[PDB]
């Protein structure tokens, strides 16, 4: 499960809402540890 | 991240060249199909 907002909400062009800024609770190289990761996805890569 | 400002990806086709290209395609379709009829080009019908 990924948590997201818009990358640049303050955009009035064709790209508004196209790039999303998402966060994860991601696996680290050690089995017992997690890391918080922020990354960008395109609208076409995700669904609600 | 984006080092600047967000823009949409796009492709540029010379308009006149494309029109000549279709004219050639239509002329050839007419050789076996529609010698005196109408050829209409349209956008794709749907799917992903």
């Amino acid at each position: 499960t990924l948590q997201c907002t818009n990358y640049a909400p303050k955009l009035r062009s064709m790209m508004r809402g196209e790039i999303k800024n998402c966060s994860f609770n991601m696996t680290t190289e050690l089995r017992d540890k997690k890391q918080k990761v922020y990354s960008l996805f395109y609208r076409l890569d995700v669904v609600q | 991240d984006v080092l600047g400002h967000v823009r949409m990806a796009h492709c540029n086709i010379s308009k006149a060249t494309w029109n000549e290209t279709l004219g050639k395609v239509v002329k050839q379709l007419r050789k076996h199909f529609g010698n005196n009829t109408i050829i209409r080009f349209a956008q794709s019908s749907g799917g992903d």
Partner: antibody
Framework: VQLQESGPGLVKPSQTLSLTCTVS??????????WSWIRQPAGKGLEWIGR???????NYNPSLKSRVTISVDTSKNQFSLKLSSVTAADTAVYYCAREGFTIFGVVTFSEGYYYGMDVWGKGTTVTV | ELTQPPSVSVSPGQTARITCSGD??????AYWYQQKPGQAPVLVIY???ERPSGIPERFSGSSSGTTVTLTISGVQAEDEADYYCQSADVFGGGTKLTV
């Protein structure tokens, strides 16, 4: 570019107004710019009236939408504002201004920020 | 859709903090103007804290969520003005700054 407003400095109550603005040293034709009017009652803050594109397309402040027509004379480089019947509540300064916009990308994709009014005139003061 | 304090006042040299808030702000850029009495408003800030060339370094600002702040560091007597902010639906309103 300088902006110079003109119009009646006095209108009767229940009487209409026609205001213009000359774009001096500039033109109304093309560019990323939009033309617009804003009202300022002498003791109040600003109220946007409306905007016009050089294409003729317009956007009016809902508060005055039924009362306002905006038009640009691109042969004269004069920006016009027409108001319906005017009352005491309209005893205000009417300003002419040019709103900006820029371009980063494709113009047809609207890739270009937005600016509010960058270039202002002096304002027509109208007694009602 | 925005609200503003009716006034702010500072001693010369202090930072003025003029704010605007409302529902459009998380999605739209704020723009700010400094209006001297008798003059058309001067744009000081655009696109959330960017300033036009010719505008003093005193003018800066920031935002979070629904609130935007226009900050003037080192406010001088020359800065007293009617300050306005806008976002759209297409305008806002303003605050009186005395020094």
């Amino acid at each position: 570019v300088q902006l110079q407003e003109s119009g009646p400095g006095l209108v009767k109550p229940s009487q209409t107004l026609s205001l213009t603005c000359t774009v001096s040293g500039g033109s109304i034709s093309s560019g990323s710019y939009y033309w617009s009017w804003i009202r300022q009652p002498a003791g109040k803050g600003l109220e946007w009236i409306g905007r016009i594109y050089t294409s003729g397309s317009t956007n009016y402040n809902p508060s005055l939408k039924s009362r306002v027509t905006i038009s640009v004379d691109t042969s004269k480089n004069q920006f016009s504002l027409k108001l319906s019947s005017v009352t005491a509540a309209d005893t205000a300064v009417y300003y002419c201004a040019r709103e900006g916009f820029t371009i980063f990308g494709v113009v047809t994709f609207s890739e270009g920020y937005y600016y509010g009014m960058d270039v202002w005139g002096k304002g027509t003061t109208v007694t009602v | 859709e925005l609200t503003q304090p009716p006034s702010v006042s500072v001693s010369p040299g202090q930072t003025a903090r003029i704010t605007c808030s409302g529902d459009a702000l998380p999605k739209q850029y704020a723009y700010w103007y400094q209006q001297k009495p008798g003059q058309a408003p001067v744009l000081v800030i655009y696109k959330d804290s960017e300033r036009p060339s010719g505008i003093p370094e005193r003018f800066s600002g920031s935002s979070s969520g629904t609130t935007v702040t226009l900050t003037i560091s080192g406010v001088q007597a020359e800065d007293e003005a009617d300050y306005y902010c806008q976002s759209a639906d297409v305008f806002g309103g303003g605050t009186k700054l005395t020094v």
